[PDB]
């Protein structure tokens, strides 16, 4: 009785919050260790919430040969409570036809091209979209974390640089 119409990755909304606005405005580039909000659209209104919440989960896949031993595959359900330090997803806003999910990512994950899949209890998995994961100096739990803000502006978001040539005198 549940059918997913389409998923909307709010790229133009969270791309500026992730400081990736200059990179794209249609593709979704996200930084590790930071939650991002997406929207799921149903085909028909849900009769009950929690039974429908129980039987659906979603996976993240990356690499040519994904596995749970290389940390290149992850599976997690749509739950209202869970560990915020690992992969998780909580519904922030509920509509008759749409849900707003806020996915969270661990501060230590493999970078590369990712793909999101959804699994129904009976039906097969369906691909929702693709996104890319990158390091960020804005996260306190990341290995690369810059305390200053102007240094972040100069060393990461700047595209115009200077190269010094000549002798030591001039």
């Amino acid at each position: 009785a549940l059918g997913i119409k389409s998923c909307d990755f709010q790229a133009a909304r969270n791309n500026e919050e992730h400081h990736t606005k200059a990179l794209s405005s249609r593709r979704l580039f996200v930084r590790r260790g930071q939650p991002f909000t997406i929207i799921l659209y149903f085909r028909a209104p849900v009769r009950a919430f929690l039974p429908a919440l129980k039987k659906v989960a979603l996976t993240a896949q990356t690499g040519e040969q994904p596995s749970k031993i290389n940390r290149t595959q992850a599976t997690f359900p749509i739950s209202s409570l869970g560990d915020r330090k690992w992969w998780s997803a909580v519904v922030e806003e509920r509509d008759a036809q749409s849900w707003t999910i806020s996915v969270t990512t661990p501060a230590d994950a493999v970078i590369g091209h990712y793909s999101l899949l959804l699994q129904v209890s009976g039906r097969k998995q369906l691909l929702l979209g693709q996104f890319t994961l990158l390091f960020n100096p804005w996260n306190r739990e990341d290995a690369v974390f810059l305390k200053n803000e102007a240094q972040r502006m100069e060393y990461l978001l700047n595209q115009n640089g200077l190269i010094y040539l000549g002798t030591a005198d001039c």
Binding site: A1, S121, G122, R123, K124
Partner: protein, 88 residues
């Protein structure tokens, strides 16, 4: 989802098929309000009654009337209602 597949769990196909099918019970109930269903019913009634009587007569005359037409008819009704209620 494949209706047929090897699953390493005992009675896996049963549970997989029931969870695949049974949430459509109200849809099965509601989709039967068209007159085409009535036409199909009136057609299949004769289409199933006539071979039943023919086979019942031949079977009764074959087994020295130990089992005849009424037994065949009531059995046909019993598994018809039961399979309609509990079938996939």
């Amino acid at each position: 989802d494949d209706p047929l597949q090897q699953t390493g769990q005992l009675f896996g196909g049963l549970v997989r098929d029931i969870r695949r099918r049974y949430p459509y019970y109200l849809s099965d109930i509601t989709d039967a309000f068209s007159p085409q269903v009535l036409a199909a019913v009136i057609f299949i009634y004769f289409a199933a009654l006539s071979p039943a009587i023919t086979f019942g007569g031949l079977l009764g005359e074959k087994t020295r009337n130990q089992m005849g037409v009424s037994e065949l008819l009531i059995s046909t009704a019993v598994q018809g209602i039961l399979f309609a209620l509990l079938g996939a």
